[PDB]
C-alpha cells in the first residue's frame, strides 16, 4: 500500500514496536529462570539431605 | 541537464514521477546538493 519512503518508515515502528516485545519476553524469562533455578537448588538440596 | 520547470521538485530524492521513474532515479539515500535555475531566455526559443 506504500512506496519505499514511508513504507520504510511503518516498518521502522512495527520493528520497534516488535523488538520491544521481544526484548520484555526474554526478561520476564530470564526471571522466570531465576526463580526456577532457585527452586531446583533447593530440590537439590532436599533430595541430597 | 534541462528540464521542465515544474518538474524541477520531482527531482527530490525517492520521489516519484515520469522523470524520476524514467530518465534520472535519484538514491533514497542521497547526499549532496541540487541546485536548479531559470533559464528561459538562454534556452528557450522564440520559434521553440
Known amino acids: 500500500r506504500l512506496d519505499p ?7 521502522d515502528r512495527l ?7 521481544l ?6 524469562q530470564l ?3 531465576a526463580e526456577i533455578r532457585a527452586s531446583a537448588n533447593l530440590a537439590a ?4 539431605e | 541537464f534541462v528540464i521542465r520547470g515544474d518538474e524541477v ?4 530524492p525517492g ?3 515520469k522523470i524520476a521513474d524514467y530518465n534520472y532515479k535519484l538514491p533514497d539515500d ?3 546538493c541540487v541546485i536548479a535555475w531559470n533559464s528561459n531566455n538562454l534556452d528557450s526559443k522564440v520559434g521553440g
Do not use: D
Open chain 1, 23 to 28: 526484548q520484555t519476553y526474554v526478561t520476564q
Open chain 2, 9 to 12: 521538485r520531482q527531482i527530490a
Open chain 1, 5 to 11: 519512503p514511508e513504507a520504510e518508515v511503518q516498518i
Open chain 1, 15 to 21: 520493528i520497534t514496536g516488535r523488538l520491544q516485545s
Open chain 2, 15 to 17: 520521489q516519484t514521477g
Open chain 1, 31 to 33: 526471571i522466570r529462570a
Open chain 2, 30 to 32: 542521497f547526499t549532496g
Open chain 1, 45 to 48: 538440596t532436599k533430595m541430597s
